[PDB]
Amino acid sequence: KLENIKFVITDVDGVLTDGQLHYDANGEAIKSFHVRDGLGIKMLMDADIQVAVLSGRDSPILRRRIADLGIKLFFLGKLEKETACFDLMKQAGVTAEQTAYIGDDSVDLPAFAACGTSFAVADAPIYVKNAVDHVLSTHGGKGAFREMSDMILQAQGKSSVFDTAQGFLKSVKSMGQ
Amino acid sequence: LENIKFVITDVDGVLTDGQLHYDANGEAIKSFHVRDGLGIKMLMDADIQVAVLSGRDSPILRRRIADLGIKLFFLGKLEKETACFDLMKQAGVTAEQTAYIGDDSVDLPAFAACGTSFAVADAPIYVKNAVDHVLSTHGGKGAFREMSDMILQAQGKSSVFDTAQGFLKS
Amino acid sequence: QQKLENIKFVITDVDGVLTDGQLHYDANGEAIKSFHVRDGLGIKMLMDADIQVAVLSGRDSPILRRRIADLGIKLFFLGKLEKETACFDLMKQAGVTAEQTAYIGDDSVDLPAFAACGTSFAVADAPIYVKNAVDHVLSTHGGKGAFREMSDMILQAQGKSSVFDTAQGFLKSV
Amino acid sequence: KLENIKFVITDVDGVLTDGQLHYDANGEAIKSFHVRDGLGIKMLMDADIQVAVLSGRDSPILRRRIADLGIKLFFLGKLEKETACFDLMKQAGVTAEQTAYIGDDSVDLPAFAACGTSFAVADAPIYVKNAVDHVLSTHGGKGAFREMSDMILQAQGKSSVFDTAQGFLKSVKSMGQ
Ligand SMILES: [Co+2]
Ligand SMILES: [Co+2]
Ligand SMILES: [Co+2]
Ligand SMILES: [Co+2]
Ligand SMILES: [Hg+2]
Ligand SMILES: [Hg+2]
Ligand SMILES: [Hg+2]
Ligand SMILES: [Hg+2]
């Protein structure tokens, strides 16, 4: 099934971050994203795999990161993830069987069921790890998304875009974040 | 645990990893954990009241409390045992119905004041020896959540976090 | 151990000891410094046990000064890279001998401070050549309560562990 | 080989940092470096080994760090690192055989190839680790640069600047960051 993925939907907190919410007096003040995940996001888009974001918490900081990544499909501040999954797939033009999801907590359980393939980050709780198809070995916010994107691209015969200097230079124009 | 109706949590080293992020004006950022926030909401949904106890008051901590809908708290005081009793009275519960989670010496009187106590995984030996249950998770990395899952499970409500259908109700 | 019981002054490095060594920059320099709450309590415990505490940092910033004010630290030498003389100047301000002073560090800059002090501690993530030069290597990483591990050790050595290890023991100094 | 190093080029994110990009609503807001790396950088320069920074991103935060460190050689904003390497070498007046590089991701693969010696931080992926000469034991942003500088200096018989009080003091006038 990894070979047929055309869409990846990722949760944000605890997946693209280590779960920390850095607050100031006004709310989230800083969100910390991982550079290697950003590169994995860019590699998937470059392999014509779309990437969408689902997050129960909306912030202009998350929105900036999304814009920096060139992500156009996403639902922020929405608690019902199963429905958003189906709405995003329709917007992406793909089926659930062509989509993979990566999450870290209970809110993601319906998202795992709606998607054809699911991943849990390494520090997700056991009831989330037990629900997915693959448990990653990397903690959320430490490159788990990248671990998954490398996995998918490898399954699609595209490991050369990240595992040799040459494949890399041939996509570099689209690798920015 | 089945009879816990109120949970009081220290903030620094429990809801955070103990780091105090300063600028020239004092704390500038406080880092919480997303999975603990969900655990807090699960408890409240399960009619278990939640309070925060902290000897550091800051508008940052108050913004986090507001975002989580936490209704009870005592910010600014170093004498936690008294704060425990005053909070129990506000909550309408007895000590045997209240659990506390802490990480340091200042929490010792609070564990003793409460019926049940939890220590985070990186609490010092003397704090760990004083509690009923030592958590396996480090402060600021989901130790409150580890605690709340255990209380809800004990009360027969693990379905609110352990299955998709289970979760889909609330 | 013998020395620990006679400590009356503790001098601490800041980066890599009271912090995990990260320098959080914005375009103007350090923008945030991250300390540990359990260290703050170990510091107050030492002061309450009549053990003076000073900071010795080769970097000076309004952020670090704010942290020192909150902690109630009165003695500090900030902005001097050569720590050997600053250790001595600090002991003079404190009114203590090198033999009555302990230092906690993490890096080569601290080597002269360990030699100047009577007792020395290294954080768990200090490099081998720093761990090999101190009297006691801590098991806690810097920025994660390494100062507290040391203060609990000093207070324990002086028969004052009660101020941190029991509820009753504690309530007296709050 | 370590004995002949005269120039060290270092990637930034994931090497001098732990890889996190700390965002606010306007992009990166904080960059987090490590104090012992900064001392390693000064030790190198003091021991006649120049240091250069290479990053696919440019920011006034990174420039401030570079300025504080006394680093004069850098190439920022360039995503194609192999030619950046030769350009920095030419600025340094040193050859590739006398240059060492430290990186953490796919983008650095061409950089390892262009330098004479290469190092990967401990949390780099397998494909980056397999490509370098030496895999360090320290994670990026936690002193991996310092692990490398210490190794190079020790190889050159200059370990006394970091392993002795007397050696350090002889060079202190140059150890500020
Ligand atoms: Co999440
Ligand atoms: Co605490
Ligand atoms: Co230091
Ligand atoms: Co990098
Ligand atoms: Hg989905
Ligand atoms: Hg209590
Ligand atoms: Hg000293
Ligand atoms: Hg190079």
Curated annotation (Swiss-Prot), chains A, D:
Disulfide bonds: none annotated. One of its GO terms (molecular function) is 3-deoxy-manno-octulosonate-8-phosphatase activity. Mg(2+) binds at D11, D13, D104. Its cofactor is Mg(2+). It comes from the Bacteria. One of its GO terms (biological process) is lipopolysaccharide biosynthetic process. Belongs to the KdsC family. Homotetramer. This is 3-deoxy-D-manno-octulosonate 8-phosphate phosphatase KdsC. It comes from Haemophilus influenzae (strain ATCC 51907 / DSM 11121 / KW20 / Rd).
